Design a protein around this ligand. Sequence first.
Ligand code: POV
Ligand code: POV
Ligand code: POV
Ligand code: POV
Ligand code: POV
Ligand code: POV
Ligand code: POV
Ligand code: CL
Ligand code: NA
Lengths: 131, 487, 140
Amino acid sequence: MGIYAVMIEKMILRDLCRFMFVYLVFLFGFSTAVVTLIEDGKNYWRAPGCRPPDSYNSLYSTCLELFKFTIGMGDLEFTENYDFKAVFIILLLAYVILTYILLLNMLIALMGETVNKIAQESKNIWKLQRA
Amino acid sequence: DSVGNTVLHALVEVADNTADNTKFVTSMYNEILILGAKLHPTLKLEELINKKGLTPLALAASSGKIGVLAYILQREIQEPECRHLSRKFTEWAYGPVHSSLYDLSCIDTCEKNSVLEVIAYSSSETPNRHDMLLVEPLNRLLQDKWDRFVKRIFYFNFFVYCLYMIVFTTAAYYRPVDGLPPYKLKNTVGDYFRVTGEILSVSGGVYFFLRGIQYFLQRRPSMKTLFVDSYSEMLFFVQSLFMLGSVVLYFSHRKEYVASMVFSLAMGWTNMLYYTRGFQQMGIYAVMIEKMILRDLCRFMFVYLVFLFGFSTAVVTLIEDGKNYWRAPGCRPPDSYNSLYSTCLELFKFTIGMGDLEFTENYDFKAVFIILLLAYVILTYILLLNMLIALMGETVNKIAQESKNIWKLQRAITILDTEKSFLKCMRKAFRSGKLLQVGYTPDGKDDYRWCFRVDEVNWTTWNTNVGIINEDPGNCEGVKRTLSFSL
Amino acid sequence: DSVGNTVLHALVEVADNTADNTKFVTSMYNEILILGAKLHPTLKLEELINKKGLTPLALAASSGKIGVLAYILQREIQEPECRHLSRKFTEWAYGPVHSSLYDLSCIDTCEKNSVLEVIAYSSSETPNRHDMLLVEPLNR
Ligand SMILES: CCCCCCCC/C=C/CCCCCCCC(=O)O[C@@H](COC(=O)CCCCCCCCCCCCCCC)COP(=O)([O-])OCC[N+](C)(C)C
Ligand SMILES: CCCCCCCC/C=C/CCCCCCCC(=O)O[C@@H](COC(=O)CCCCCCCCCCCCCCC)COP(=O)([O-])OCC[N+](C)(C)C
Ligand SMILES: CCCCCCCC/C=C/CCCCCCCC(=O)O[C@@H](COC(=O)CCCCCCCCCCCCCCC)COP(=O)([O-])OCC[N+](C)(C)C
Ligand SMILES: CCCCCCCC/C=C/CCCCCCCC(=O)O[C@@H](COC(=O)CCCCCCCCCCCCCCC)COP(=O)([O-])OCC[N+](C)(C)C
Ligand SMILES: CCCCCCCC/C=C\CCCCCCCC(=O)O[C@@H](COC(=O)CCCCCCCCCCCCCCC)COP(=O)([O-])OCC[N+](C)(C)C
Ligand SMILES: CCCCCCCC/C=C\CCCCCCCC(=O)O[C@@H](COC(=O)CCCCCCCCCCCCCCC)COP(=O)([O-])OCC[N+](C)(C)C
Ligand SMILES: CCCCCCCC/C=C\CCCCCCCC(=O)O[C@@H](COC(=O)CCCCCCCCCCCCCCC)COP(=O)([O-])OCC[N+](C)(C)C
Ligand SMILES: [Cl-]
Ligand code: NA
């Protein structure tokens, strides 16, 4: 168990820090482009599909709605208050491909390499932690 | 010959980097230099160019001849009257520690066909580009060109580009919404800052445009396969096309300016992954991101989109119109799913983790609808996504050394492109050569060659060398030459 | 010297853990102890400290000199009149099985610069911290 938590440390510092920089660059990058698309209500009207009648016009709401694609709860039709439905989906599809398909599955592969290379080192860091 | 190749050029174009071919070619390259000094010493054989203007060292860098390149840059010739042909010297040796000097005659960017510039600006058809910067002069030359006068320029370029994107975010977040895209300047302090952020946004879009034009035309005459070589300069140029295309759609009374400003905004933060080079563990990470897009995501998104468009065609063919014109609103999408776009969108949600699996009821034959969905989830979600993680697992193991070398080439292009920006910095870009004396020429004159200094140590070979430049060790702004020189 | 390093301290700060450097430094560290016993045996050379208060064994642990550390803790000297300089002894040997004794003079936490305390409380700029506890006294 102690070797296991030394490996947890070496995943936070080596693989999760390199992930959460490039992830938050992609998350804040595409969510900026989604808020810039979407306007206010402008039709003041729509059937409540799950009922969030919402001003998604905040940057915080869209960064929260693009984080849900990473979990597995990404709505992909989370608002309709925009124009140009084509460039809204092209933003979301380029986000899911870059982050969910590419960047998460790459994190699992890069955690796969690190386990192979710290398999002896994490035993020795643990013996220093016990010492 | 008719090509212009002399004897030393022909030894370069013969060698093909294998272990047996490197062994005698660099042995024959030595013996002809030694004969070239003994027969008539007034002629420097390596200054002779062919009809492409290449020296024999620049020819080894222009092609992928790494073994000839590793020999010339590290050439030590022990024989007196031939010591001046050496490109590696030692200036002192105090017991275990000795200080090596690598000559920087045609390399170090001050010349025209400098092999540091020739390697980094190659056209990717030449082999061993990533490995030619690992020879012992060229690695420490770029690293000490990085550690001073470049990393402060590169961190400044990464500071302005973050300040460029924060301005272009805020100018686009607070865009006007009232009407047609020529918007009147209301006399408020907010709309003054808003149009200030838009002028700074377009002026950056003009800048990355003009930086891309000078890459295409002025510097670096690019081939058609070189546009699929340099992915970064395309990505900054395509960003400036969406930014300048936004301005064209802005004044043309078209609301499609926001459709192009948004593509410049999402691609603009995606191009923040350019500047993550220069940080070593982050720069290797983004080279691996490149090799996952090109090698593993391209092979995935072909077979994925074949499976996605394949099963979604079979689902639309099943489902009809409403035909019952009735059902309780489970999440309330009462919808015509009879579009092909809606079903391709509903089968994409299985890949995310939001696949409904009962997304419509407007069909017949409920059995063959679920058998389509279950064969889709098994082929794509269970098989093809989990296989992508395994194939990304293999690629990481095989590019673990390669991505470190591609990064050092990515940093090397940054170091050379920084030096091209200033003619004043080129006189600062003499990398520590100090105009050092490395012995005497034939006719007995001072040699005075720009030499990069490398400290070394050996605990088995104690270096009682014939040619050692300084008799006093170290460097303390006080020099003393050795009397062991024939001249 | 001005640093306070004696001859055995200087052999520590010379060694840089490579395979060739470890080989003769621990060979030279032996021959000076053997000469240090034959010339005048009343002086214990490893008790001499520099101006940082480090012994030659504590200096090998304070820096990352694992090959000097692996030698001193396992030092067997076969020559009589120099057997007392050994840090590894055997107390009995019955056929195949023999029982080794590792001396714990400055190590085992009772002293001030105990090398078990020096290794574990290092400042992470020193190399081989995780590997210095794998030498045969310090692991067991
Ligand atoms: C918001 C959610 C965050 C979740 C994760 C945050 C968790 C806490 C993060 C805290 C801050 C990160 C620093 C870690 C601890 C500092 C000590 C150190 O030396 O660093 C590491 C160096 O390891 C590396 O050099 C490889 C990774 C590069 C650093 C990534 C920085 C990107 C942003 C990061 C921030 C991301 C978010 C910010 C986005 C803008 C420790 O590794 P080491 O084994 O001790 O030494 C290896 C020696 N080597 C360098 C020669 C190999
Ligand atoms: C540096 C640290 C980085 C970290 C964070 C970065 C800072 C973060 C934030 C920074 C500024 C935003 C906070 C202001 C809050 C009130 C504004 C407001 O809403 O009022 C008015 C707008 O007013 C504007 O137009 C906003 C100004 C836009 C300037 C764009 C370029 C900025 C740099 C210029 C040159 C630089 C040189 C000078 C530099 C000093 C009314 O708003 P509205 O238009 O009617 O409604 C929009 C609708 N929406 C809001 C729902 C979408
Ligand atoms: C006002 C608003 C603008 C904000 C300004 C911020 C941008 C402008 C700031 C520019 C200066 C940044 C320099 C910080 C590091 C110090 C230099 C150093 O030597 O450390 C080293 C460790 O560094 C790392 O390994 C961490 C990796 C960081 C990568 C991402 C940059 C984060 C900047 C903040 C977030 C970006 C913002 C994202 C978008 C907003 C780097 O060198 P090395 O090669 O790694 O190691 C040496 C090799 N060795 C291992 C063999 C020893
Ligand atoms: C829609 C979402 C797309 C998301 C991803 C798209 C991202 C951008 C895609 C851009 C287009 C794809 C080409 C990549 C760049 C061109 C340069 C090149 O040489 O190719 C690669 C060659 O690497 C390979 O040969 C292995 C992969 C085979 C290509 C897969 C094509 C399938 C469809 C693809 C389109 C999928 C979608 C279309 C479906 C109909 C570069 O690899 P290299 O390391 O430089 O050289 C290796 C040398 N080797 C060949 C000897 C090993
Ligand atoms: C895992 C993470 C995902 C989770 C989600 C968490 C994400 C958190 C995201 C955001 C923080 C949440 C707070 C803000 C949102 C609520 C209020 C709002 O609507 O916006 C307001 C502020 O305006 C802005 O939000 C800034 C405008 C553009 C952003 C520029 C940031 C620069 C990059 C910085 C570096 C980052 C780069 C990082 C890259 C590594 C605008 O509204 P208002 O009209 O001004 O208000 C009316 C009142 N008034 C008129 C009197 C003032
Ligand atoms: C929170 C507050 C926010 C609001 C305030 C912000 C207001 C104004 C904000 C941003 C202004 C917009 C600038 C647009 C120009 C393009 C931007 C860019 O990144 O390109 C270049 C900028 O490199 C340069 O330096 C070009 C000169 C810019 C003017 C100097 C600005 C210094 C201000 C700083 C003073 C502070 C420190 C002073 C020191 C004490 C760098 O890119 P590249 O690497 O050369 O090429 C790309 C890679 N490629 C080769 C693959 C294509
Ligand atoms: C990550 C990606 C997932 C995201 C989803 C994105 C997927 C995008 C998917 C589709 C694009 C979206 C636009 C079309 C749908 C909206 C309109 C409609 O209902 O269909 C209409 C068009 O008819 C068709 O759609 C074509 C019919 C069969 C498809 C043949 C394609 C051949 C393969 C090509 C190669 C592909 C192979 C690729 C394999 C690698 C039919 O309706 P209508 O009755 O004609 O309209 C009435 C008006 N009228 C009568 C006046 C005309
Ligand atoms: Cl309800
Ligand atoms: Na889900």
